Structures are given as structure tokens and as C-alpha cells.
Design a protein around this nucleic acid. Structure first.
Lengths: 181, 86, 164, 76, 155
RNA sequence: UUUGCUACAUCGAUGUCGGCUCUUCCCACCCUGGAGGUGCAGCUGCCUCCAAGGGUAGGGCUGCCCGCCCGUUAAAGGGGAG
RNA sequence: AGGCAGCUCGCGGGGUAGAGUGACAGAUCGGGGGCUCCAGGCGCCUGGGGCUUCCGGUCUAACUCCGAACCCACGAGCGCCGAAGAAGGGGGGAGUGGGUCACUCGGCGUAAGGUUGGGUGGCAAAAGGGGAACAACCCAGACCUGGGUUAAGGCCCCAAAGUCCCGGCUAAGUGCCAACGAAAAGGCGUCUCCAGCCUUAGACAGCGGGAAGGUGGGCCCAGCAGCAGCCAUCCUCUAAGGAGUGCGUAACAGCUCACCCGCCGAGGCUGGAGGCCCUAAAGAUUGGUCGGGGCUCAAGCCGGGCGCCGAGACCCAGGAGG
RNA sequence: AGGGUGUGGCUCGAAAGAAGUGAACCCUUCCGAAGGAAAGGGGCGCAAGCCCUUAGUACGAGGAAGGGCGAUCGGGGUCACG
């Protein structure tokens, strides 16, 4: 089957300035601004209407229409990020040896896991804020990918407890998303 | 863009560089076109969308307009000899 | 011996028992199982799609596995009738002398190379021949497709399943 | 534009089911010659069927206001 | 059922089987691209069905027939004391027909029966003008019917 | 990489077992490196996937090859080159 | 002064492929009825055996009640050769009695570039043009020199001629292989045709709730309070629910199995087969592969089309010899 | 790798080969076998392209006549590239 024509609309809310030029779409808002390049969306026309975003493609197979609906979800994530922030929570779970975590510039350092003297270090993506309250870690930001990747780097560095041992639940784990702020 | 009313230039064939007006969309890769009063006459038949080059000028016609109907829309916009503006 | 040796046709049909001494007994002894004459709704069949031969070893293993599966579902005399149609008439023979008589400087090599019978097989000379079928009621149509799929795995020839 | 409805039998090893998902198709084209060429290329390319084995039986124009399938209605 | 057919040998004589080569000698087609005119009857038909894979034939009309008889050359006329005398005029027909043939005293009264090995040329425009094989069943060999007349025009 | 089957090449000759010496290759992974599962608490095991960069030794018995055995080792893998 | 390597018509011969088995001989799987004996149970029932009868099913190199395509004998006709090149008769000189491969129909064999038969064709004893190179495959039979048109095969560069045209597919460098190099199995990966069943009298998925009550009925159990050893099966009911799944639990309990509400507002679900691709798919005589470069809406694959190049083949001019 | 051919460079050329009774090379006209266009004009096809006319015209192996210049060609040795 080939869907002859398919067209979608994304409403731009107030307090948001959307700019489009040479396949690069940037959204400016109160919380921040996000810039994303959509040069890989071949066969898709992106129209910048006066009050909404217009996406059109004709004769889409199973792969062209899959691409079109991912671009829609990316755009709606950019709009949300510049109005409301993104906030992921991570929990710090320890069994016997308490875990100490601290932030130093663009790096998170985890020390005193199950007892080891190595210090585990995780990269922090641009435009992201990491704070430690207690037993919890909070990651802030507007771009959802950078917020999610940063929280996953913290997740991945402490996995190494998951080598050579039957898992007794020791590490740092993702918790939830999306406070209003 | 390729839609009804767009004025195109023929790329292949014995026509090869003549004014042409899109009047209908047939399928995924063919459209119906005609030349109302070309000096030799661009006949009314189908054309492959790879054998035409769309211009910037455009007219206002309905889908599947007859040849006589199209001639009235080019003169309304004064495109009888304004085709060669590019 | 690998089944690729006796899956293809090599020569004519070799069946006449009165000119062939010393044929081993086939592995298959029971060809009809269940309760025939029962009341059944579906009459699904196993149909080949090539020409070849099926050894009596493959034919008996495809039967035990299908009977165990159906008997595992509800019962034995209950509403199913399992029937294997072809009989192994053809006799397959092996030039065994490469084992014993090929090393006494006896008729070794290809000298006196007519072979001795080792078992029987079922020639399948037409395209689309029935090999097995099973009859069940409407509530058992699903456990009957699976029995024929498992049995089709132990047979040399490519087959289908047809429902009627 | 003359939406056409082409019906016929195509062969792969004794294969005949005259109904609507292994036998026949719908086409939108100016004349009958164009519609037949489409059927040969689409079935020959997507299923590896030579033109010996495609037997077109009926071709006729259907009215645009009555088609079972809505995919061909949407590009009209 | 037309009353007159023309047959052309479209393959050479190397590696041709025993049966086939002897039949083509009786039809007077020794080597490639020589043609012959025969009446259409059940006796000749069974011969063409045997050597079908080496020839092509069909029914002549006026333009194909008139064109075959004109092609004769110095070693291609009819048996005017052998010699294959190129006709080119009625002069050879004002003295030759007085032996076996009758009613033929003008090039416009040479429409009835028989001929000799007519030696042709390979076809202009590629024998693969629309084909790729003189070796394929009906792809280029065998019976073609009225189409034999446009093939003669090419050769 | 065995053992047979065939008799295509060499019969006015291609020196026919084993060992030693020296070089290189394959991967179907014995150890060393990475990841996972487990009837994985830890130590030790068992199994699956990637990977041929490095290693894979000393002796008793037999002409051997295979094999059995002694004391160790991270392990003391298995094959090709007429 | 006739001859037959071919065909047609006429008139005859034959038991092969197939097909059958109640038409003979052998084999071979099930059911119903009738008769008998034996054993078991309380005249009956059940099992085994033998005979008969009826119904269906599986086979044959050494079976046949049947039976093609096809091959062959004779007569006539056609076609070709023949008084220039000559049926029957006579005479002189040989060589040969190791064959081999491809296609096709077989016997033996697990097979083999094995061995042994029937038919056709090359090589032997055959050049030249294609297949990378190649006795044998495809085109084709070379007296010498020049001109032309084609066959097999090819047209991005090596290298003469297409960076040719239309509809589709593949993302692996798969592939770029007539003879030459991959199976069973798995993939809704993507592309296509058939079935069947639900859809604006609101489907599928999802979301909140009702998500259930006598009763957690129960037999057995301290208790399994669906789901530990067998199992039924009733309405306070209507826009709502079954006496009811997998987890589990000493036992619970609870999530989930099943039916309605509320939302939502366009199609959805399950089988069958096909194309390409992926996994299956692992070696070294030493060092990378379609011949190489390299190629990705192709220079690959599928269904079609158009034009050209290209032999000593066929056509033409001149020359030579028998 | 080696000979045969095509195009060039340098060399030897008295005789036995042609040649002042004209070598070699340039111009023009004419005939022309098999074969055989394109540009232009008109029509058809989505397209590559095709059909009618141009036209069997231009051309085309060979062959025949005239004009100019005028002394080397054939042949031998060797080297480069296809």
C-alpha cells in the first residue's frame, strides 16, 4: 500500500518564537532555546506557517511514513522543552558501603561503591544541570536528549557492579520524569 | 512545486523546451498536461514527472480544465507572451 | 548411513519379493491409529511437493512423534484418527562389500558391485501425494496442525498442510 | 482519467484464486494500453512472473463513485 | 490457405544433424541465406516441420514475390542451360520458356510455379532488429505467415 | 586433516617411515582479552557469543605415530605447507 | 535408365510411458455382517484365532483386461540426383580393430572428469569469432587480396559500441557466473498479490472505573479460599461480568484471565503463497575479490523496450587452380 | 621474450631493379559494384526513438582522362610506439 497524501499540523503556542531556514529549525522560549537539523528528512516538505508547523509527503511507503511521524515527535519535544523543563530523577541504592557522588564541572564522580577504590566518572552533556539532594540525583534541562543521555551516562558508569556478581541491587538507577518544571 | 496550474518546461521528447501547463494528476509518476496555443502545439497527453522542469509562474484553473478553459486563464494573467520572462 | 544416499532415485522399482532373498522387516507395523468411524468435522492432510524416496526409518519416527503429541492433548481412542497411507514397497540395497569383502582382496573395488538389501522405502512418483492425514472435531483443529508440523520435520521431502 | 479494473489469472505452479488479495488489481490510467503495461510490470517485478503466465481476462472502466478500496479513491 | 510459400535458410551448415541436412538439400538450401519458392501442399509442409529450427517461411504476396524474382544475378538466374542467367529483361524469356514452361513470354507473365536457389544477403538493420536469437522457437525461426514479406524486403 | 572408490599425470625415476633443525599459515578457541546466562551468595564450576595480537614447556616406556604414565604449569589446543 | 538420405497419403506390425488390480501372479493397510473354537467375567458380555461376504486404501525390472507419443515394412505421389559428373558387374592399393567429451534416454554404484549400453554433435583429422585464459560449449566450415552486412556475444574505463528509456526491488559490496560455488530451518526486514473474521448501531491498541457478589460453595483437608488427588454448575441482572487464567502462596491475599461503562474517532485482526535480502554460511597449499579498476534511484537484480558495435559466416569486385 | 605487420627517426644505396621516352608527390573532371546517410520540413510515442519526404541523393572499392612540379622510388641495416 502507498498512502497517496498525508499532512500533519503542529500548533505553535504563545511565548514561542519558531525560526526555520535551510532545513534547520530553532525554537526560542522562556526556559531556553533548542536548535535541531532536519537535513536527513528526504522526501518531506517542512512548511513554516504563520501559526503552525506543516509537514507533507505523498506516496509514503512503510519507511517514509515511519520517518515522518518521528519528525513530528521531535518537534513536539522541542516545543515542550522550551516551555516546561525536563527533570529526570535517579536513586542511589547501596547495600553495605555508602556511595558518595559529587559534581565537578562537566563530570560526575562516583566513589566507594561495593568497596572499590576506583572512581567512576560520567560525562555531562551541554546545557544540562546536575544536582545531588540526597539518595536522589536531579538532572535538568530543555533538550530532552541531552537530559536523557546525561542521566544514562550516570546510569551506565555504575553498572560495573554487574560483573562477576549475582546482582544484589547496588548502583544508581533511573526513577521518573517530567515535573512541571 | 508540482500541482495543478503550474507552468513547466518540457525536458525530453521532440518538444524539448516548450511552455506547458499541468492540468491533472494521474498517478505516482504521471500528470496530464497541455499546451493551449504553442506555435507548434504541445499536445494534450500525459508526461512523466521526470521529463518536466517546473517554473515559478502559475495560473488559476480547475482540475481537468479543458483546453479552451486554460487559454482564458493565461490571458487573464497576461501570460500569452509573458512565458519567456525567465 | 546418511539419508542423502537413499533420498534420490537410482534405478527402477525393486519390489518383487520372490526374486529378492533376505529382506529386513520394516520399522512401521501400525499404519492406522485412533478411532476411525468417529464423528469428525475436519479432515486435514499432509501433502508432498517433490519426488523422492522415504526410508522406513523416517516413516516410523514421523509416526511416533505425531501420535505422542495428539495423545498428549486429550486421549487415545478419543476424537482423532491418525492414518499413514504409503507403504514401503521399494527395497534399498547397499554395496556392503566395501566393508567386509572389499578388503580380503576378495571382490574388492567395484568388482561384482550389485548390492545387498538393507531396508525398504516408499517411492513418491507424483507431485502432491498424500502421506498422512488426521481427522478431528472443530475444537481440536489447532492441536492437529501442530502434530503434522512436528511430524513434517522428520521426513526428507518438502510438504504442506491442507485443511478441509 | 478512467479508473480501470483489471481481472485475470496469474500462474505460479497451478495457482488460481479469483477474488481480492492473490489474483487481481486496480489501475488509474488514460487508456487500456497504459493500464495493461502497468499490470505486467508490477506483477512481473514484484513476483518474478513472466508475461507467458499472466492471463488477463476482463478489463473495464469502473465509475469513480463506487470502489471497495479507498486507497485508489484518495488520489482522485 | 495461400498457394505459394517462400522459405529462407537462416543458419549455417556446421554441426547440423544427419536427418536435417539431407532434407535441406532436397529443398535446395545448402548454405545460409538462400531462398526458394514452393507451392503450399501437405507434402512440403511435413518437410518444413522437420527442418523448422533452421529456416523461416510464410505465404508470399505480390510485393514479396515480385521482389524475389528480381534479385537474380550472374550465377542466380533460372536454369537457362544451367548457367543461372540473370534475367534482367524479357530477352532471356523470349527464348528459354519454349522447353518446359508455358504462357511466359514477358516478365509480367512469370507468376506461376518454380525457381532455383535464390542467393540472398543478411537482413538490413540487424537480424536482431527486434530479436536476439534466430535459435529460439518462433523468436526468429519457424512459420511467421504474412510477415515473411517484410523480411524479404530487408534482405 | 583418516580410510576406501576411480586409474586422469609421472615407469629412458618427482629419493619411499619416524626424528632433529628452521620458517610460515588456518580457526572448528586450550590459556591470555571483552560481553552475557545459570539450578550464578562468595571461592570454584558449567554453557553461549566476539577475537588468531602473544603462549602452549620438561621427562619414563616404544623405531615409531597413536597411547599410557611422572613432576610441574596461566594453559601445557587441534590442523596445513608434494 | 533408373535411384532413395527426406516428407505426405493409403494399408499393416508392435506392448514401451501411462493406467489398472473383482483380468491372471505376487505383495499390502483398515472397517461392517455371518459361522466356529479357546480364555476371562456375571444364557450374555469382552479378547484372540480360522473361513466367508461386502466397502474403501497402497505397489511391481523378471504382473497385464488395456494402452499413447513414437519407430518401422510395402505401394503411389512429391522432393532431389541422373545420359557432363552414370543403378548393376569386374579389377589394383590401402589405413583402421586403445577412442574421448557435451546434450539426451537408460543398467550398476553413496557418488565420480567412474564404469557399461541406445541416439545426435564436436574433437580426433577444424582454422577464425565469443566463453578472462580453455582439444570437447555457443557462432561458424579458412583458395588469395580489397569493400560491405550480420551471428554468438557485448556497449562506464582497461576495450570497438549506451554513463540508453519506462515500471519496481535490494543496503548486504548481496551481486557484477549459460556450462561455475549451498540445503533443511528461522525473519510482518521490506515489497506484492487469495481467503476468512470484526468495523461510524463507534473495531483494534490504549487509558480510569465497574474490575465483582451466596461462597472464600464445596469432596479430601489445620488450609490450597479457580490453578495440590475427580467434578458439576445455579441469579440481586442490565448501559455491567464467567461457579473464574498465568503467577503464586504451608494458606492466603493480590496483579492478571473474561464481560460493560467513559474517552477516542479510521479502519483493524488471523491464516496461505510469492520476490529480494539477512542468519544458517567455518581452512590453510603463501597474499584482496566479479578477469581488474571500481560501482549504490546502480555499472546490481526482476518485467519490458529502443539503437548501435562485432567473424575468414552471407553479399560484391579483381586474381589463381582442379 | 620474437617473428609478422602499421606509422615514424637515423643510416647504405656502383652494378645486377624502375626512371628525364619522366621517379615521387600534388590539383581537376568523369564512370562507379555490393552497400548507403544526415541537416531541413511534416506526423506518432511519457521516453530512448520511429514513420513520410530529403533520396537510392551525398558518398562508396576500383577504374579513366587531363594539368603542376619536377629526381628520386622499389630494396637492405637498426631503433621507438601501436
Amino acid at each position: 500500500l502507498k498512502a497517496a497524501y498525508i499532512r500533519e499540523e503542529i500548533q505553535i503556542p504563545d511565548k514561542v518564537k519558531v525560526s526555520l531556514e535551510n532545513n534547520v529549525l530553532k525554537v526560542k522560549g522562556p526556559k531556553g532555546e533548542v536548535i535541531k537539523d532536519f537535513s536527513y528528512a528526504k522526501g518531506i516538505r517542512i512548511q513554516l506557517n504563520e501559526g503552525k508547523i506543516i509537514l507533507e509527503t505523498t506516496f509514503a511507503d512503510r519507511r517514509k511514513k515511519a520517518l515522518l511521524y518521528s519528525i513530528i515527535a521531535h518537534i513536539k519535544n522541542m516545543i515542550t522543552g522550551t516551555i516546561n523543563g525536563y527533570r529526570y530523577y535517579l536513586k542511589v541504592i547501596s547495600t553495605h558501603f555508602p556511595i558518595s557522588v559529587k559534581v565537578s564541572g562537566d563530570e560526575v564522580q562516583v566513589s566507594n561503591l561495593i568497596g572499590e577504590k576506583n572512581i567512576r566518572r560520567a560525562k555531562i552533556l551541554p546545557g544540562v544541570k546536575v544536582t545531588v539532594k540526597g539518595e536522589d540525583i536531579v538532572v535538568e534541562g530543555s533538550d530532552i536528549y541531552n537530559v536523557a543521555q546525561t542521566a544514562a551516562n550516570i546510569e551506565s558508569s555504575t553498572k560495573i557492579v554487574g560483573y562477576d556478581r549475582r546482582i544484589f541491587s547496588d548502583g544508581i538507577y533511573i526513577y521518573k520524569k517530567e515535573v512541571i518544571g | 512545486a508540482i500541482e495543478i496550474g503550474r507552468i513547466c518546461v518540457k525536458t525530453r521528447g521532440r518538444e524539448a523546451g516548450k511552455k506547458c501547463v499541468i492540468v491533472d494528476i494521474i498517478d505516482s509518476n504521471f500528470v496530464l498536461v497541455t499546451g493551449p496555443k504553442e506555435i507548434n502545439g504541445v499536445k494534450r497527453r500525459r508526461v512523466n514527472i521526470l521529463h518536466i522542469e517546473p517554473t515559478d509562474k502559475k495560473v488559476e484553473i480547475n482540475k481537468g480544465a479543458t483546453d479552451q478553459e486554460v487559454k482564458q486563464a493565461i490571458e487573464q494573467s497576461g501570460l500569452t507572451d509573458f512565458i519567456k520572462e525567465a | 548411513r546418511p539419508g542423502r544416499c537413499y533420498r534420490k532415485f537410482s534405478g527402477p522399482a525393486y519390489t518383487r519379493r520372490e526374486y529378492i532373498p533376505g529382506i529386513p522387516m520394516p520399522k512401521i507395523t501400525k499404519f492406522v491409529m485412533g478411532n476411525v468411524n468417529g464423528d469428525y468435522d475436519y479432515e486435514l492432510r499432509l501433502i508432498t511437493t517433490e519426488k523422492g524416496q522415504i526410508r522406513h526409518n523416517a516413516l516410523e519416527a514421523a509416526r511416533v512423534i505425531a501420535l505422542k503429541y495428539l495423545s498428549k492433548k486429550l486421549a487415545s481412542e478419543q476424537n482423532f484418527a491418525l492414518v499413514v497411507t504409503k507403504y514401503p514397497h521399494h527395497v534399498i540395497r547397499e554395496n556392503k562389500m566395501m566393508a567386509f569383502a572389499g578388503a580380503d582382496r576378495l571382490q574388492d573395488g567395484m568388482r561384482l558391485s550389485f548390492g545387498k538389501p538393507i531396508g525398504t522405502a516408499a517411492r513418491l512418483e507424483k507431485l502432491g501425494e498424500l502421506v498422512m492425514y488426521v481427522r478431528v472435531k472443530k475444537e481440536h483443529l489447532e492441536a492437529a496442525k501442530e502434530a503434522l508440523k512436528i511430524a513434517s520435520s522428520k521426513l526428507p521431502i518438502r510438504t504442506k498442510i491442507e485443511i478441509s | 482519467v478512467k479508473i480501470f479494473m483489471v481481472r485475470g489469472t496469474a500462474i505460479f505452479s497451478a495457482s488460481r484464486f479469483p477474488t481480492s488479495q492473490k489474483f487481481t488489481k486496480y489501475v488509474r490510467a488514460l487508456n487500456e494500453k497504459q493500464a495493461i503495461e502497468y499490470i505486467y510490470s508490477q506483477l512481473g517485478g514484484k513476483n518474478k512472473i513472466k508475461r507467458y503466465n499472466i492471463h488477463i481476462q476482463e478489463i473495464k472502466e469502473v465509475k469513480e463513485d463506487e470502489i471497495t478500496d479507498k486507497t485508489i479513491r484518495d488520489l482522485a | 490457405m495461400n498457394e505459394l510459400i517462400g522459405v529462407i535458410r537462416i543458419r549455417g551448415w556446421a554441426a547440423t544433424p544427419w536427418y536435417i541436412q539431407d532434407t535441406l538439400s532436397m529443398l535446395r538450401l545448402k548454405n545460409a541465406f538462400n531462398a526458394m519458392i514452393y507451392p503450399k501442399d501437405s507434402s512440403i509442409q511435413g518437410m518444413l516441420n522437420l527442418v523448422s529450427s533452421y529456416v523461416t517461411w510464410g505465404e508470399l504476396n505480390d510485393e514479396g514475390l515480385r521482389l524475389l524474382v528480381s534479385k537474380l544475378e550472374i550465377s542466380r538466374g533460372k536454369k537457362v542451360n544451367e548457367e543461372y542467367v540473370k534475367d534482367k529483361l524479357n530477352v532471356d524469356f523470349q527464348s528459354f520458356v519454349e522447353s518446359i514452361k508455358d504462357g511466359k513470354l514477358r516478365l509480367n507473365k512469370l507468376d506461376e510455379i518454380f525457381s532455383l536457389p535464390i542467393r540472398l544477403h543478411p537482413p538490413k538493420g540487424g537480424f536482431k532488429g527486434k530479436v536476439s536469437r534466430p535459435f529460439r522457437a518462433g523468436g526468429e525461426f519457424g512459420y511467421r505467415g504474412d510477415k515473411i514479406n517484410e523480411l524479404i524486403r530487408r534482405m
